[PDB]
Amino acid sequence: SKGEELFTGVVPILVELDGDVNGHKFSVRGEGEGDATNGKLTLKFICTTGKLPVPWPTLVTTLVQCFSRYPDHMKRHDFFKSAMPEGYVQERTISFKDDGTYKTRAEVKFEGDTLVNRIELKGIDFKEDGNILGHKLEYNSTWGSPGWVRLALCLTGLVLSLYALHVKAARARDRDYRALCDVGTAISCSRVFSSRWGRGFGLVEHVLGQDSILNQSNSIFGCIFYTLQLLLGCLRTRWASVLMLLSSLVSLAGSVYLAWILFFVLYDFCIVCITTYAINVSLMWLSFRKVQENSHNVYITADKQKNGIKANFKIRHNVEDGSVQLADHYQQNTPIGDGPVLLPDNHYLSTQSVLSKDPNEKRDHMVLLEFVTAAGITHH
Numbered sequence: 001s002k003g004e005e006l007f008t009g010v011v012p013i014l015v016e017l018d019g020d021v022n023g024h025k026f027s028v029r030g031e032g033e034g035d036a037t038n039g040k041l042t043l044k045f046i047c048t049t050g051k052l053p054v055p056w057p058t059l060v061t062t063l064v065q066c067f068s069r070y071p072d073h074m075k076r077h078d079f080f081k082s083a084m085p086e087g088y089v090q091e092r093t094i095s096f097k098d099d100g101t102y103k104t105r106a107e108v109k110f111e112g113d114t115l116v117n118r119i120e121l122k123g124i125d126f127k128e129d130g131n132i133l134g135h136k137l138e139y140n141s142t143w144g145s146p147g148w149v150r151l152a153l154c155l156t157g158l159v160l161s162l163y164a165l166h167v168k169a170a171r172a173r174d175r176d177y178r179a180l181c182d183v184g185t186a187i188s189c190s191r192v193f194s195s196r197w198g199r200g201f202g203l204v205e206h207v208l209g210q211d212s213i214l215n216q217s218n219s220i221f222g223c224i225f226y227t228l229q230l231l232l233g234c235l236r237t238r239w240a241s242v243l244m245l246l247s248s249l250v251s252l253a254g255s256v257y258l259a260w261i262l263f264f265v266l267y268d269f270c271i272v273c274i275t276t277y278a279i280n281v282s283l284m285w286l287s288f289r290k291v292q293e294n295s296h297n298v299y300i301t302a303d304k305q306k307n308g309i310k311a312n313f314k315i316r317h318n319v320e321d322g323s324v325q326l327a328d329h330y331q332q333n334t335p336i337g338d339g340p341v342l343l344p345d346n347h348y349l350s351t352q353s354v355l356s357k358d359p360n361e362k363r364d365h366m367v368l369l370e371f372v373t374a375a376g377i378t379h380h
């Protein structure tokens with residue numbers, strides 16, 4: 001499109017937002033530059049009216065997708081650049097799960113040589129004690145709390161593993177030892193842990209042999225597993241999530257096998273064993289959900305009825321208590337001018353944000369670095 005030649009250089013950016021959230025009114029100004037060739041934008045935002053009544057991360061999506069890098073084979077699907085320089089109107093509803101809602105309207109046009117994004121934001125039905133009005137979101141921290149849930153599952157698993165190990169040693173030093181989990185002649189964790197399936201899952205011998213250092217009491221694997229689940233719960237990166245998922249899968253397989261042993265070989269209803277199986281399914285589901293929550297894509301489809309596009313996506317904001325806050329975005333773009341625009345096939349934008357602070361800025365502010373690439377259409 002013709003508007004493309006407006007984006008091959010470095011473009012200055014002005015962003016102006018006036019907001020009102022549960023009656024707390026505020027203004028934000030941002031300035032910076034966009035480099036669509038690299039899909040890179042760098043902007044600094046100031047709250048001009050004082051302290052921002054909402055967390056900065058929640059405003060990132062509102063505070064210029066024409067700076068996305070569309071690969072050469074997808075240039076015919078770049079609506080945002082084709083609406084320039086006249087621009088487009090971008091409207092959104094952002095629904096925060098179990099809390100309030102943002103409603104936004106923006107005009108994005110060229111004024112002289114400046115790309116200008118002017119926004120009105122109205123937020124309603126927010127909880128004063130919630131994560132938003134309560135300022136409980138993490139800004140950019142790379143480690144933090146694991147969350148009450150993960151903490152309970154992992155600590156419980158760790159204590160039960162510790163006691164299991166203690167039982168195995170005590171029973172090995174005394175046949176008449178009766179454990180806490182020795183409930184009856186048919187419920188004896190002592191008998192379970194001291195069975196050959198109590199070491200290396202009764203499998204490590206047949207593969208790596210009996211001297212292998214992997215031939216540890218199953219509860220040793222328990223200690224390491226729950227410990228790593230708990231520390232990985234403290235990291236805020238993709239790879240920690242995948243590791244949590246893989247370890248959860250291994251624990252799942254081992255738990256299914258050990259349950260089969262419990263009911264069809266040992267004829268034992270080991271209450272502590274069933275409990276660790278349940279905890280392990282819980283962690284399986286949590287790591288599965290975590291991996292799903294890792295996706296940051298903007299899903300774009302053409303809207304012929306408005307000669308523009310529509311998009312929807314989910315943002316997950318980290319909460320200081322270790323939980324996550326969902327923000328369901330629904331988005332509409334319509335051209336301002338009357339010249340031709342590109343209506344794309346289905347695709348998505350992949351975006352990466354880096355939030356930081358300016359050590360020299362005394363006003364409430366956000367430094368933002370962003371890389372955005374279009375994808376979702378295979379080049380073949």
Ligand SMILES: O=C1c2ccccc2C(=O)C1C(=O)[C@H](c1ccccc1)c1ccc(Cl)cc1
Nearest residue numbers: 160161193197198218254255258261262272273
């Ligand atoms: O030694 C064991 C055994 C022998 C026969 C039948 C069942 C089991 C176990 O549950 C197993 C455990 O003790 C052990 C376990 C049981 C109870 C509490 C903490 C740890 C365990 C290890 C790995 C997984 Cl993934 C699940 C459970």
